[PDB]
């Protein structure tokens, strides 16, 4: 997260870190046994780390649970990142508590202008690299689809939206991938992609979760 702020320990209790020996993506807990992340975060041997704040220090609220199953969206296209969404089932149910909480799926889509909370342990620099240890947060509005598609001609699909600040300075970034964009109490976005980070006229691109709620619910119900 570039230009964000320190969330505060466990203030984003649905935020998970996906770990394969190191943090490599965020993900959002959607129930005790399921995380949603970006399909581009897919790897074998994922451990989901819940209750994390400082991802490099055991602070006492963590639950580390291995994934039993990863389900990448049927139509995920890694070239275009269209349908950049994946479900990860945990080997065992997370113990839900105030610091490890699920986030509601949308029942409908969010609108341009809606303010969202984007969070992650991704790079905090737009030039160069600094990875934070504690969770970073960014409040960012959903941008009109037209500004999104103007920003990234030929790359934005109906399964994507832009959020952030065309001015630059405030964005998600590498390492935030897969993490939540939560708007009005619902997971509306997954950190998906962008050009660099917090660059002028290159807002964050986010998987449009509300397109996937049927698939998520059906997939979870069947798995
Ligand atoms: N500007 C953003 N919103 C944004 C930009 C990039 C982004 N990328 N995530 N992850 C990512 C993963 C791997 C590489 C790599 N092969 N070197 C680079 C980036 C996630 C969000
Ligand atoms: Ca920790």
Distance CA 97, CA 206 (A): 28
Distance CA 96, CA 129 (A): 34
Specify whether 40 is catalytic: yes
**Ligand in nearest proximity to the CA of 134:** 2
Write the DSSP string, 208-221: EGGGSHHHHHHHHH
How was this structure obtained?
X-ray
Q: Are strands 136-141 and 34-37 parallel, antiparallel or unpaired?
A: unpaired
**Ligand in nearest proximity to the CA of 135:** 2
Distance CA 56, CA 135 (A): 11
Ligand 1: residue whose CA is nearest its atom 8: 174
> Does 204 contact ligand 1 (Cβ within 6 A)?
yes
Locus of tokens 């070239």: 79
Domains of the chain are: 1-12+103-210 (2.40.10.10), 13-102+211-222 (2.40.10.10)
User: Which residues are CB-neighbours of 176 under 8 A, at least 6 positions away?
Assistant: 1, 26, 118, 119, 120, 121, 122, 123, 191
Q: Are strands 136-141 and 115-120 parallel, antiparallel or unpaired?
A: antiparallel
How would you list the strands of the sheet with 180-183, edge to edge?
5-6, 136-141, 115-120, 180-183, 186-193, 204-208, 160-163
Specify whether 84 is catalytic: yes
Q: What is the resolution of this structure in A?
A: 1.8
- 128: which 2 tokens? 């160069």
Locus of tokens 């620099």: 125
User: Which residue, among 195, 45, 211, 190, has the nearest Cα to 120 in the 3D structure?
Assistant: 190
In ligand 1, the atom with minimum distance to the C-alpha of 176 is: 20
Ligand 1: residue whose CA is nearest its atom 19: 174
Ligand 1: residue whose CA is nearest its atom 12: 174
> Does 1 contact ligand 1 (Cβ within 6 A)?
no
User: Which residue, among 108, 173, 101, has the nearest Cα to 140 in the 3D structure?
Assistant: 173
């Amino acid at each position: 997260i570039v230009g964000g702020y320190t969330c505060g320990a466990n203030t984003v209790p649905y935020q998970v870190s996906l770990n394969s020996g190191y943090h490599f993506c965020g993900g959002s807990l959607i129930n005790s046994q399921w995380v949603v992340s970006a399909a581009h975060c897919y790897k074998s041997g994922i451990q989901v780390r819940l209750g994390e704040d400082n991802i490099n220090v055991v602070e006492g609220n963590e639950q580390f649970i291995s994934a039993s199953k990863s389900i990448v969206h049927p139509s995920y296209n890694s070239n275009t990142l269209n349908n950049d969404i994946m479900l990860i089932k945990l080997k065992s149910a997370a113990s839900l508590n105030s610091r490890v909480a699920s986030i509601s799926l949308p029942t409908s889509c969010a609108s341009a202008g809606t303010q969202c909370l984007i969070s992650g342990w991704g790079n905090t620099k737009s030039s160069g690299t600094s990875y934070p240890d504690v969770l970073k947060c960014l409040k960012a509005p959903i941008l009109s689809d037209s500004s999104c598609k103007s920003a990234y001609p030929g790359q934005i699909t109906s399964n994507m939206f832009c959020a952030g600040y065309l001015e630059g300075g405030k964005d998600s970034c590498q390492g935030d991938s897969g993490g939540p964009v939560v708007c009005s109490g619902k997971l509306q976005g997954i950190v998906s992609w962008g050009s660099g980070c917090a660059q002028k006229n290159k807002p964050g691109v986010y998987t449009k979760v509300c397109n996937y709620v049927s698939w998520i619910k059906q997939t979870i119900a069947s798995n």
